[PDB]
Design a protein around this ligand. Structure first.
Ligand SMILES: Nc1ncnc2c1ncn2[C@H]1C[C@H](O)[C@@H](COP(=O)(O)O)O1
Ligand SMILES: Nc1ncnc2c1ncn2[C@H]1C[C@H](O)[C@@H](COP(=O)(O)O)O1
Ligand SMILES: Nc1ncnc2c1ncn2[C@H]1C[C@H](O)[C@@H](COP(=O)(O)O)O1
Ligand SMILES: Nc1ncnc2c1ncn2[C@H]1C[C@H](O)[C@@H](COP(=O)(O)O)O1
Ligand SMILES: Nc1ncnc2c1ncn2[C@H]1C[C@H](O)[C@@H](COP(=O)(O)O)O1
Ligand SMILES: [Ca+2]
Ligand SMILES: [Ca+2]
Ligand SMILES: [Ca+2]
Ligand SMILES: [Ca+2]
Ligand SMILES: [Ca+2]
Ligand SMILES: [Ca+2]
Ligand SMILES: [Ca+2]
Ligand SMILES: [Ca+2]
Ligand SMILES: [Ca+2]
Ligand SMILES: [Ca+2]
Lengths: 204, 204, 204, 204, 204
């Protein structure tokens, strides 16, 4: 594991090639979780922020951006979308959390909570995933669509297996996150594929 | 009689099913009243905020939202609408009050008074009502329309039988409301029907 | 005479009926004057703010609102209009003054002077008028047009027979007006006709 | 020799008649100069701010306003236009300067310098001019066009025969101008013709 | 070898003639670099900010402005464009840097970093260039297009052969730049050609 503290992955161009493979020992199905990260991009079109597929399952867990001020979350091919007021272009800090028992999906854009939506109550996101950054999988680790490619910068990615409380969300947002157990920026296990440069985080 | 303090009812999806039944011993006709509550929703369409029907009377008392910055009040099937400047989406604090003698309906969005309008002077809203949250009744407790369904969060609901003065409105708005006698959030009598979760109020 | 201090006339609905008759001992023709009052309405259309007719003379003195940020003044059937930047809806404090010698009409929206315009230099507004609030006269005290009706609230009306200087305008605006001699809110002589309620001024 | 300090000329109506003739003490051809004044108008159309014609030459020196946020300067029938961000309606403080050697025209709207433009390098603006305020000359002191008439208020006019430095521009803007030698508000030689009133400057 | 400190080149008009030739002893190919400068223009169309051509190669290094809030960078005929929120018209401070090893182009508008883009990784911009200001070269020092001509003011130009870090960018922006080795405003070697005046920097 590498400590990417103070740095970010910069996907410099539109392609159906460049991407990063995040590696995690997720052996037991996900029931609860929280995902946080920063992104900076001036793309007007829709693009995938975080793709997570398992065998035979497309969009098992996908954080997709529809257009400005509109974020979508997919849980087992199901989808919820919540709106927010935001400038364009501008850096963003996203934290999305889901909880099987209630099915309640909760977005936190820049330390601000959006309206709660619910989906797939009592479902379990399948274990042993293929997590890619920069592209949107339509297969287990592949079948990328160019019009869904993310071009910009991504940093400070953390994923916990629990549903973080407001205090913990804001801390992450403020730069002092709790240690993550599913994916941690300070001990990341990745695989750079294609054209993707690592540079320091200058916009925070 | 449950204390929903620090919590809110979250209606997570559009449906013609989910709703909450508020129960109150209103056995003697309403002549004066004040209703206050918070709501957070990113729905662009129209939707009912508070439905109150009595036997044989539709829209006896309905707080309906026409569109952004436009609120309506129905008293015995009659209606008044007042405008306000507001952002979208964003949490809101609404207090509406009516007084039979003058017929004056008074809205207070986020501690700000909108222009007064008048309707049904000298009328009495029937007692023994059917009060639902999350749907719009077209019958006594039923006949819901999906296109009027409320999806988002609701909290801090209080209803007094008198017409509250400015200082009492602002207190409610500020989080220190006067004890209500028709409906009280700190001693609520409800019936969750369908998909509606209870979660803490994080947006205030 | 009645002291309407801290109160306002609220015209709660669109009609060709409701109005208030202001009674003033004006027996000698007007040569100079200043009018001030507050208004709060969310009407989008045009409406009359202050109508003043004399026998045979329509629009002898009329303060009419064309549309948002556009105020008109009629003096003996002649008209001037001046623009201002304003929000909608929102309470307003208006002061308009006219002086026969120069013909200079001067508007002051919310303590802010608009551009001066000129009309009817050397004219005298007839005395022994018919002053109505809430409707637009097309005859001596009558012939109301529904599409010109004012619906909203009006308060703090004062009318002097002289042309007030800036410091006196701002005082009125700040709530400490000079005693008026043609019409005074603290000693008003009115006649309510139709549906018009008196309530306290909550929006100032 | 009149001191118009603290006052302004108010042109109260659209006409092809009202105007003021400025008479200047200096009889030399112009090579360098600086002009400053305040204006307040809510006219949406184009209109002439300051007209200066000499026998046989139209638009020898003309400060014309094309539309909102767009100011033009004519030197010997030649023209330059520069843009600025501005509200409408709102009072303005304009200072324009030209210098024959370089041909550099320099505008300063509300103490803010616009982009420099250049015209008629090495030209000399004729002497024995006809300077009118409120109309746009198409002949020596005449041939006014109604659609170019200025209606609103003008005050604090000063004109030097040199090109004033930033400090001196800001002083004029702040109300403590350097003594002018071509035209001075505190010792103006004018000739009102038509309907134009003098009133105190209430908007500064 | 001139010190243009506190001054700027002002291109006063649209032409296919006026321009300035920057002279630099670049005999060895560029691999890394940083360019910074201020510009003030109210041109709505596209225009070239900085043209750099070598023998045989067009657009070897060109900083071109597409439209408002949209900046392009060309490296060896290849192009990247990045967006930013900005007012119009308004002065701007631009710093663009490129690094052959990664191919990462980095823009900094008014001390604010835009999203990184990448082009020509492992390329070397040819040495012994023809650098013009005010026009866009389509040949070695010539073939200007009128529709790409820059009209406005440019100042504080500096160009280093290294990729400056955030601190050094902000210093340049704040007026205390590091000494440049490829092009230095305080020791500039230029050649004015056509109508271009030098004046002091009044807008900073
Ligand atoms: N090529 C293309 N153009 C436009 N919109 C697209 C495209 N591919 C997918 N989508 C949309 C369809 C879904 O709404 C979302 C994820 O679909 P998924 O099927 O997982 O890619 O993206
Ligand atoms: N299905 C549907 N689509 C759009 N607008 C509707 C619909 N049903 C009612 N309304 C409108 C009609 C009334 O103006 C208001 C309450 O009507 P009420 O009759 O009490 O439902 O909502
Ligand atoms: N019914 C109606 N609709 C719209 N505008 C109207 C109407 N009646 C008058 N007006 C306009 C005409 C004048 O410009 C102004 C006052 O006219 P006065 O003639 O004094 O009413 O209002
Ligand atoms: N009547 C009229 N309507 C609109 N625009 C006009 C009119 N007369 C002149 N102009 C324009 C033409 C020039 O651009 C400017 C000054 O021209 P000058 O010829 O000095 O008046 O004003
Ligand atoms: N005349 C004209 N009008 C509009 N856009 C133009 C023109 N000439 C070039 N361009 C565009 C074409 C390229 O996108 C960019 C640089 O092209 P380059 O070929 O280096 O000039 O400018
Ligand atoms: Ca997919
Ligand atoms: Ca896809
Ligand atoms: Ca109904
Ligand atoms: Ca219904
Ligand atoms: Ca009339
Ligand atoms: Ca009428
Ligand atoms: Ca002319
Ligand atoms: Ca003309
Ligand atoms: Ca070229
Ligand atoms: Ca070209």
């Amino acid at each position: 594991h590498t400590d990417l503290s103070g740095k970010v992955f910069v996907f410099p161009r539109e392609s159906v090639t460049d991407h990063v493979n995040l590696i995690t020992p997720l052996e037991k199905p996900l029931q609860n979780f929280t995902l946080c990260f920063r992104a900076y991009s001036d793309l007007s079109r829709a693009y995938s922020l975080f793709s997570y597929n398992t065998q035979g399952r497309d969009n098992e867990l996908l954080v997709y951006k529809e257009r400005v001020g509109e974020y979508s979350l997919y849980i087992g091919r199901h989808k919820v979308t919540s709106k927010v007021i935001e400038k364009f272009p501008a850096p963003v800090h996203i934290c999305v959390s889901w909880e099987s028992s209630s099915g309640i999906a909760e977005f936190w854009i820049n330390g601000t909570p959006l309206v709660k939506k619910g989906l797939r109550q009592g479902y379990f996101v399948e274990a042993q995933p293929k997590i890619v950054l920069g592209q949107e999988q339509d297969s287990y680790g592949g079948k990328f669509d160019r019009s869904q490619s993310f071009v910009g910068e991504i940093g400070d990615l953390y994923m916990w297996d629990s549903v973080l409380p407001p205090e913990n969300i804001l801390s992450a947002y403020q730069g002092t996150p709790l240690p993550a157990n599913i994916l941690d920026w300070q001990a990341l296990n990745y695989e750079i594929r294609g054209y993707v440069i690592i540079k320091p985080l200058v916009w925070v």
